[PDB]
Design a protein around this nucleic acid. Structure first.
Ligand SMILES: [Mg+2]
Ligand SMILES: [Mg+2]
Ligand SMILES: [Mg+2]
Ligand SMILES: [Mg+2]
Ligand SMILES: [Mg+2]
Ligand SMILES: [Mg+2]
Ligand SMILES: [Mg+2]
Ligand SMILES: [Mg+2]
Ligand SMILES: [Mg+2]
Ligand SMILES: [Mg+2]
Ligand SMILES: [Mg+2]
Ligand SMILES: [Mg+2]
Ligand SMILES: [Mg+2]
Ligand SMILES: [Mg+2]
Ligand SMILES: [Mg+2]
Ligand SMILES: [Mg+2]
Ligand SMILES: [Mg+2]
Ligand SMILES: [Mg+2]
Ligand SMILES: [Mg+2]
Ligand SMILES: [Mg+2]
Ligand SMILES: [Mg+2]
Ligand SMILES: [Mg+2]
Ligand SMILES: [Mg+2]
Ligand SMILES: [Mg+2]
Ligand SMILES: [Mg+2]
Ligand SMILES: [Mg+2]
Ligand SMILES: [Mg+2]
Ligand SMILES: [Mg+2]
Ligand SMILES: [Mg+2]
Ligand SMILES: [Mg+2]
Ligand SMILES: [Mg+2]
Ligand SMILES: [Mg+2]
Ligand SMILES: [Mg+2]
Ligand SMILES: [Mg+2]
Ligand SMILES: [Mg+2]
Ligand SMILES: [Mg+2]
Ligand SMILES: [Mg+2]
Ligand SMILES: [Mg+2]
Ligand SMILES: [Mg+2]
Ligand SMILES: [Mg+2]
Ligand SMILES: [Mg+2]
Ligand SMILES: [Mg+2]
Ligand SMILES: [Mg+2]
Ligand SMILES: [Mg+2]
Ligand SMILES: [Mg+2]
Ligand SMILES: [Mg+2]
Ligand SMILES: [Mg+2]
Ligand SMILES: [Mg+2]
Ligand SMILES: [Mg+2]
Ligand SMILES: [Mg+2]
Ligand SMILES: [Mg+2]
Ligand SMILES: [Mg+2]
Ligand SMILES: [Mg+2]
Ligand SMILES: [Mg+2]
Ligand SMILES: [Mg+2]
Ligand SMILES: [Mg+2]
Ligand SMILES: [Mg+2]
Ligand SMILES: [Mg+2]
Ligand SMILES: [Mg+2]
Ligand SMILES: [Mg+2]
Ligand SMILES: [Mg+2]
Ligand SMILES: [Mg+2]
Ligand SMILES: [Mg+2]
Ligand SMILES: [Mg+2]
Ligand SMILES: [Mg+2]
Ligand SMILES: [Mg+2]
Ligand SMILES: [Mg+2]
Ligand SMILES: [Mg+2]
Ligand SMILES: [Mg+2]
Ligand SMILES: [Mg+2]
Ligand SMILES: [Mg+2]
Ligand SMILES: [Mg+2]
Ligand SMILES: [Mg+2]
Ligand SMILES: [Mg+2]
Ligand SMILES: [Mg+2]
Ligand SMILES: [Mg+2]
Ligand SMILES: [Mg+2]
Ligand SMILES: [Mg+2]
Ligand SMILES: [Mg+2]
Ligand SMILES: [Mg+2]
Ligand SMILES: [Mg+2]
Ligand SMILES: [Mg+2]
Ligand SMILES: [Mg+2]
Ligand SMILES: [Mg+2]
Ligand SMILES: [Mg+2]
Ligand SMILES: [Mg+2]
Ligand SMILES: [Mg+2]
Ligand SMILES: [Mg+2]
Lengths: 85, 61, 96, 200
RNA sequence: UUUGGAGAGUUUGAUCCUGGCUCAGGACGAACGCUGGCGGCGUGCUUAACACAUGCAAGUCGAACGGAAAGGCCCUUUCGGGGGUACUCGAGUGGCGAACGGGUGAGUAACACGUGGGUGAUCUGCCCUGCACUUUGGGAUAAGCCUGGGAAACUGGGUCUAAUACCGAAUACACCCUGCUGGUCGCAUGGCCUGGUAGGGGAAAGCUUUUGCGGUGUGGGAUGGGCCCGCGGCCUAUCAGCUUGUUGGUGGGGUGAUGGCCUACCAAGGCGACGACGGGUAGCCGGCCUGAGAGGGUGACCGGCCACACUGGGACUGAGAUACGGCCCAGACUCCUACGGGAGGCAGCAGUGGGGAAUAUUGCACAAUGGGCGCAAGCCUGAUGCAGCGACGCCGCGUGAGGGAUGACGGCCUUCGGGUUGUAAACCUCUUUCAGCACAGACGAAGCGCAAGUGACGGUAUGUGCAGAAGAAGGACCGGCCAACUACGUGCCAGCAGCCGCGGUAAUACGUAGGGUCCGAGCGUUGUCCGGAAUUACUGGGCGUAAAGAGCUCGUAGGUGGUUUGUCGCGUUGUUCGUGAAAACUCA
């Protein structure tokens, strides 16, 4: 770091890491809860958790933290697991 | 590796930085190098005017 | 947005600028997808030739020329043809 | 750079006339040297080199750009020998020398370096001009006022102007029409050995 | 229906063959010796990927916001300055830009590289172009002021302010997912007809009132990208077995996208003598040198890719990280300190220490063009355009000309006659390029500005004048190869030298002289590479003795086939459009 532009960029990148780590940790906790519900073996609560987690996943993906097709991928994989059980 | 000393007179005493080139010598079996004259501490032998360039000598004046 | 570049080759004291349509992302001398001419000011006329059809197809496909390229296109009348305002104007001074 | 030493030495060592009017040669044809009588052993390389040198000094051409002559002649599809003789006779120097506007090729070169002529209306001051076909060569007012050029133009009564070359009038306009042919040129020596030596 | 092959010397008393060595040529990112005048045009650390004194090589937006440190204005003034003025602005966010362009080749034998497909398996801001919408509430932080630590960098605590900075909700029903029903294609899951059906889910932001620009999704396309594909692309078996996530299946996890990318369990296999794995070497290629050719060598510059950034690792940011001047940690190097702790990474342009033979200048400009920014003006850009250094490479030019004796000196040989340098020289006339001194003097810019002007190069390139042959030639060789010979001086010494070989007193081979030869502002030496080398013999070798058939058999793999009757044509050529980048070579 020897230029004002680069130092300002590092500041901004640290800020946005704080933000993105928060959002991604929230998403991971949602997916973890969904996984716990599934290996416990519930149906209606599993579906409601699917609803909430999908809503927040879509919000995050639109915000741009993660990426659309893979978001659809794990959401549909989770739906497949639910319908399987 | 040994080197051959051209010309007729030389100013080389032990521990004298020199320049060396490539060239075989048949008379000397263990010799395969020459030593250019007129460079570093090795000057061309005086009294040379023919083939002056090969030995590194200046003109007359 | 691939832009109309002027590829450069040769040596120092006489630069060369070939008209190249390419992305600005690559080097200034980088990948040239399609060449339509060259530009060199070393010669006093600095003659320039333009392929109107290819230039127009690139413009309609999405290549935005750089300001000097657009100015030279107006000079050759290709800009006039594309705009349709004055028509096609031929005033280029072909080299003596 | 050009040749600054004696010119008669060249003819004397070469054994043939170069300029053409050598009293010294006819007085002593033997090449210079304290041993101009020693018998010379037959050598194909010797004769090839002899021919090469004679042609080169005859045309005043420098060694490297005459190698360029030979390679260019090879490049052209025609026969190498006649292509070379064509491209070397195309020299503006030889053109002026053989058109009666230059007593000697060296003087033609000197005048061209001085830059006293206009070629196709454009000033030029370079000896080795490439005289193409259908071209026109002029002479400018200061050259006209020059004395020796006047003398040359009234003295052009030597070996007459070759077939494709001709002078139209007093202003001495020189124009070439058709393709010079080896037989009509009758330039001396044979290209055979020159081409052999350069193909070595 | 057209382009294009040189040998010579050296064994023997004397041949012929074979065979070995050397030379006659082109070429260098070349270095040294001598020489040296200008201009034009390129080229310029190949070794130490060694550490690097200083500075330059990455910034743009008040018409997003708060403000005013310095300036412009006006009300005021005790001249300390006090208010507002937005012309303007420091920094402050926010963006955008920084992944560009420039550099280097140590490692890398790999889908690393050229070419040929691709994807019904991905994304992609900034560009244009048809086509819905952009309602709404809230909060916080910098900056600032105060305080504190601390030389320091740096830091915290407290108050306060705004938003193109932030988040919720409104909708969407054309998009992403899931449970039910047709047609087309087949190269398969299945794709396309946004095929039909039921469920649920999801985005935005404003700026200027003027050639007006913004935000979000996806039927159209492009570009930059990833994956893997046949083929290929050093040397060493005096490197023969290697491999365990290794090899495949299933299931999960993971990726922008299938897949041992990662995990668990199943089976034991996969790679291997049409050279695995091992070792040394080294960026690949269009190309450069050579060769008639095939072929050999090789990777200078330019350019297409790759990989690297003091050495080893990892990750964030986003459409885009190997992230060179972005971040963290570890080691080394150098440095600061008020000794608590900090700064670093020239292979960016130049520059210096060292290595070495050696590779130049701590130069000017955005004049043009690419590149970053903006609505543009306008700003930045060692990318660049140029300038200074260097005979290092291709090319052009100058240091005179005409005549001048049965040929003036003087030298050198002489048979003592003389030859010899020599048209040379001085001499009489001439033009005086180029340098010297002046004048004029371009274009490089229908390019930009709603302004009047915008060119570093350069007051150069280029024309016109002024006095003057006036300021201008050297280097290698001369025994045979090999175009160039004689005398003087020492004689197995002193020495030359490419191979043969040259001196044991009278050398064309040593040195000196003359004279001559080749070349020429370059001339030689040296060294690397091709050639002749058909001297690794495919074109195009040999095996009796010159070097070679093993000691002789059977016989696996591989290599190869005694005939005609028959098809598919995968070996093959047959043609048509359809790829082969630019740049380089060949023709005009
Ligand atoms: Mg600094
Ligand atoms: Mg967390
Ligand atoms: Mg966690
Ligand atoms: Mg995002
Ligand atoms: Mg998946
Ligand atoms: Mg699945
Ligand atoms: Mg670049
Ligand atoms: Mg013009
Ligand atoms: Mg502009
Ligand atoms: Mg040849
Ligand atoms: Mg040919
Ligand atoms: Mg012999
Ligand atoms: Mg023999
Ligand atoms: Mg014999
Ligand atoms: Mg010099
Ligand atoms: Mg030059
Ligand atoms: Mg240059
Ligand atoms: Mg800005
Ligand atoms: Mg401001
Ligand atoms: Mg950006
Ligand atoms: Mg970046
Ligand atoms: Mg970058
Ligand atoms: Mg480079
Ligand atoms: Mg380098
Ligand atoms: Mg490397
Ligand atoms: Mg490998
Ligand atoms: Mg491809
Ligand atoms: Mg982008
Ligand atoms: Mg709203
Ligand atoms: Mg505050
Ligand atoms: Mg408010
Ligand atoms: Mg809402
Ligand atoms: Mg709604
Ligand atoms: Mg619905
Ligand atoms: Mg419909
Ligand atoms: Mg907004
Ligand atoms: Mg492929
Ligand atoms: Mg291949
Ligand atoms: Mg699986
Ligand atoms: Mg699958
Ligand atoms: Mg896999
Ligand atoms: Mg598994
Ligand atoms: Mg490498
Ligand atoms: Mg090739
Ligand atoms: Mg060949
Ligand atoms: Mg070959
Ligand atoms: Mg190569
Ligand atoms: Mg390039
Ligand atoms: Mg390259
Ligand atoms: Mg590629
Ligand atoms: Mg690295
Ligand atoms: Mg990096
Ligand atoms: Mg960097
Ligand atoms: Mg830096
Ligand atoms: Mg560094
Ligand atoms: Mg640099
Ligand atoms: Mg050194
Ligand atoms: Mg050094
Ligand atoms: Mg610009
Ligand atoms: Mg804007
Ligand atoms: Mg305007
Ligand atoms: Mg600037
Ligand atoms: Mg600035
Ligand atoms: Mg320059
Ligand atoms: Mg140099
Ligand atoms: Mg030099
Ligand atoms: Mg020249
Ligand atoms: Mg005269
Ligand atoms: Mg002008
Ligand atoms: Mg004009
Ligand atoms: Mg001129
Ligand atoms: Mg003049
Ligand atoms: Mg000699
Ligand atoms: Mg001879
Ligand atoms: Mg001889
Ligand atoms: Mg003697
Ligand atoms: Mg000798
Ligand atoms: Mg001589
Ligand atoms: Mg060779
Ligand atoms: Mg053979
Ligand atoms: Mg034998
Ligand atoms: Mg045998
Ligand atoms: Mg045996
Ligand atoms: Mg067929
Ligand atoms: Mg076909
Ligand atoms: Mg094709
Ligand atoms: Mg082309
Ligand atoms: Mg060629």
């Amino acid at each position: 770091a020897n230029i004002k532009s680069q130092i300002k960029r590092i500041r901004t990148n640290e800020r946005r890491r704080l933000r993105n780590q928060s959002v991604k940790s929230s998403l991971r906790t949602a997916i973890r809860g969904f996984r716990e519900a599934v290996d416990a073996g519930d149906k209606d609560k599993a579906s409601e958790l699917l609803h909430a987690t999908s809503r927040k996943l879509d919000k995050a993906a639109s915000k741009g933290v993660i990426h659309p097709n893979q978001a659809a991928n794990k959401k549909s994989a989770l739906a497949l697991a639910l319908n399987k059980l | 590796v040994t080197a051959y000393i051209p010309g007729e007179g030389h100013n080389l005493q032990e521990h004298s930085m020199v320049l060396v080139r490539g060239g075989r010598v048949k008379d000397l079996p263990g010799v395969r190098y020459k030593i250019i004259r007129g460079s570093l501490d090795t000057q061309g032998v005086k009294n040379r005017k023919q083939a002056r360039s090969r030995y590194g000598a200046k003109k007359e004046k | 947005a691939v832009k109309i570049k002027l590829t450069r080759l040769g040596k120092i004291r006489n630069p060369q600028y070939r008209i190249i349509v390419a992305d600005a992302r690559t080097r200034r001398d980088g990948r040239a997808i399609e060449v339509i001419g060259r530009y060199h000011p070393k010669e006093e006329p600095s003659l320039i030739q333009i392929d109107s059809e290819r230039a127009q197809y690139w413009l309609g496909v999405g290549a935005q020329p750089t300001e000097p390229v657009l100015a030279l296109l107006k000079i050759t009348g290709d800009w006039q043809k594309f705009k349709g305002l004055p028509g096609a104007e031929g005033t280029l001074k072909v080299k003596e | 750079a050009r040749y600054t030493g004696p010119a008669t030495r060249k003819s004397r060592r070469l054994g043939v006339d170069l300029v053409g009017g050598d009293q010294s040669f006819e007085k002593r044809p033997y090449p210079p040297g304290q041993h101009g009588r020693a018998r010379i052993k037959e050598s194909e390389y010797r004769q090839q080199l002899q021919e090469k040198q004679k042609a080169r000094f005859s045309y005043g051409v420098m060694e490297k750009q005459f190698r360029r002559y030979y390679e260019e002649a090879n490049r052209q599809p025609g026969k190498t020998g006649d292509n070379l003789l064509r491209i070397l006779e195309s020299r503006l120097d030889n053109v002026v020398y053989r058109a009666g506007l230059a007593r000697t090729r060296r003087m033609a070169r000197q005048l061209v370096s001085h830059g006293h002529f206009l070629v196709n209306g454009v000033k030029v001051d370079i000896p080795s001009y490439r005289v193409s076909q259908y071209d026109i060569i002029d002479v400018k007012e200061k050259s006209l006022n020059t004395l020796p050029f006047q003398i040359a133009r009234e003295t052009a009564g030597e070996r007459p102007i070759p077939s494709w070359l001709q002078v139209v009038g007093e202003r001495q306009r020189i124009l070439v029409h058709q393709l010079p042919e080896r037989a009509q040129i009758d330039v001396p020596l044979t290209e055979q050995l020159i081409v052999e030596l350069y193909s070595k």
